[PDB]
From a paper:
However, the post-translational autocleavage of the nascent polypeptide between Asn266 and Thr267 generates an active enzyme with an α subunit (27 kDa) and a β subunit (9 kDa). Based on the X-ray-crystallographic structure of NylCA, we reported that four αβ heterodimers (molecules A-D) form a doughnut-shaped quaternary structure.
For example, in wild-type NylCp2 (Asp122, Tm = 52.9 °C), the distance between position 112 (monomer A) and position 122 (monomer D) at Cα (designated as “a1”) was 7.04 Å. In wild-type NylCp2, Lys159-NH3+ (located on helix α2 in molecule A) was 2.87 Å away from Glu115-Oε1− (located on helix α1 in molecule D). However, in NylCp2, the amino acid residue at position 122 was replaced with Asp, and the close proximity of the acidic residue Asp122 (close to Glu115) reduced this stabilization effect. Moreover, the temperature factors (index of thermal motion in a crystallographic structure) of loop regions 1–3 in NylCp2 were significantly larger than those of the corresponding regions in the thermostable NylC-G122Y130 mutant.
Author numbering:
A (entry chain A): 19 to 128, 136 to 259, 267 to 355
B (entry chain B): 3 to 12, 15 to 28, 31 to 91, 93 to 129, 132 to 133, 135 to 260, 267 to 355
Write the structure that this text describes.
Amino acid sequence: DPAPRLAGPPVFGGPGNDAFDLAPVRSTGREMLRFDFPGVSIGAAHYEEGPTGATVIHIPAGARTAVDARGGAVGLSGGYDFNHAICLAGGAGYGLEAGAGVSDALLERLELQLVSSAVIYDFSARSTAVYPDKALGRAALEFAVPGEFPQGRAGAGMSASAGKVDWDRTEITGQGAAFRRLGDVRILAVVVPNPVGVIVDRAGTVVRGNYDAQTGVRRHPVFDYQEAFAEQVPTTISAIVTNVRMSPVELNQFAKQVHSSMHRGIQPFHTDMDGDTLFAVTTDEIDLPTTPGSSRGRLSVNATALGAIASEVMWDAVLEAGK
Amino acid sequence: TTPVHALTDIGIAVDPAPRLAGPPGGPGNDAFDLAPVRSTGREMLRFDFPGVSIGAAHYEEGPTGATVIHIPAGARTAVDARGGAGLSGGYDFNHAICLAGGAGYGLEAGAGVSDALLERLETGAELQLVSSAVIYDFSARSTAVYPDKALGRAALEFAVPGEFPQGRAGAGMSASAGKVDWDRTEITGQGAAFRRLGDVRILAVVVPNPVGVIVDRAGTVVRGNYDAQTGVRRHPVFDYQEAFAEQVPPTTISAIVTNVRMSPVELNQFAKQVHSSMHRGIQPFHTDMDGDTLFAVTTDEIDLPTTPGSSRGRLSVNATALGAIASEVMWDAVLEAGK
Ligand SMILES: [Cl-]
Ligand SMILES: [Cl-]
Ligand SMILES: [Cl-]
Ligand SMILES: [Cl-]
Ligand SMILES: [Cl-]
């Protein structure tokens, strides 16, 4: 039963990028997750003037990627099946410019450097028109370090929010990550939930979004929706990074499986008002065995198994963003 | 002057002279003080389509460029993206479409457009929506300069109603065709064409950077796969079949804009029909090495009649008919790019 973080009403018409001399800030969030995943670095930067920001996953060697993009409001750039970086940002479609800043910083750091970017609309959660721009994307890349992720209000999660049946009940989320290692297998989940729905934990409790100040209690949106019909008639952007070799077909199905699994932690999900986008990335370092047997079952070591495990890592990340 | 049966019976005079791109690790944008140039190409197409403006700008230092179609009202859009080998937005409603060189780096030009549009609006949908697509034009020149935010802003600022610069202009500056071997690749250009039939308006814009070659309605290869040893261009299939017998022994970005109202389903099918029709003028097309992308846009100004009949047949006035007509406009635009 966490304390509320109501976004409150936006005032539109606020100052935009041209009104400020905008200084990138390295985002530290509420706490740092530390993880051991060689070849994967994360940077996050924000403008306090927004507040809004960008988070970048940099895999310098390049990595095979599948994109699973769902619903009616997707704002995506690049979308390559091979990337050196994934950039997530606020600022709606304007924030895609941060990915150009990353592409720039990748050149300066130096044949094509490939960056895929996705965004959330975060303007209703604040009272300015500031967006992540080329300078902020460059900063995020420059700030990237191995094995750290800033949880909470950091990078793209600065002004992310959940539970949009009515904006009077919408709460600020954050960004979240989680990491697991099993033998040599490594899985990192990164998520920026800006859902129309709410964040739900494994017991079914609504933990962020749709908080009613009149009652002090969060509701699952379906209870509002059903009563609304009875009376009247008559986006999340995310990445899963692993080191297990998967074919293009396996990686694409893995992406779909993990992305669907997020309707456990975010409800509703994949709605017409969401543009949910998941990047599944593999560093292609570890082979799955040629046969899928173990003591735990004849069909227990395969890409479906990896998908189920990664789905748990992603639910933990979603809960970190909502914490 | 002759009975009209085939398309060839009714043209664009393509220059037979070669324009070989020639063989290509050179300087990038910050090596230069880059000033956008308004692109005028080899000639200006003039057309009457209020609400639609086109601007084109280039950097001579590339040479590379961007071409922007601005529809300030916003327009419903279908994207048909068809191959292997860089898109931004791909929204189902757009205030602008930005086509650029520079491979994926040139998607930055669309951000320049988006930012300029946001500034004119002094973030509620007051969101300005720009979809961008790119071609890889780096093999056709010796620098790494790409269309950036400033160049996209400049293309938008240079946009005028009712004009389009044909040839080596905007995104077409360093486009090229015919890539069985780079020794036979020729520079293309960008091209546009426009038809008004009754109240119906159709504008085609294309930037062909194909693996394949540009082909006219008679079947003659007119740009790409020019063999300097023979002085002629042949269809790539002759090279491919000879290659197989020997060794295995016993992107185009485009937009089609119309004023006719179509539902989301009709528009998406219209996009697929027109895009496929381009395998007539570009061959091969939709290959694994191409990332072909077409934007089909309607300004939703006029309705088709409720019934599809006419003196020319029971099923003659419908979106399929519109797609067939628009396909010819697009082939003309392809030929203008190769001229
Ligand atoms: Cl929102
Ligand atoms: Cl839980
Ligand atoms: Cl090329
Ligand atoms: Cl600029
Ligand atoms: Cl012809």
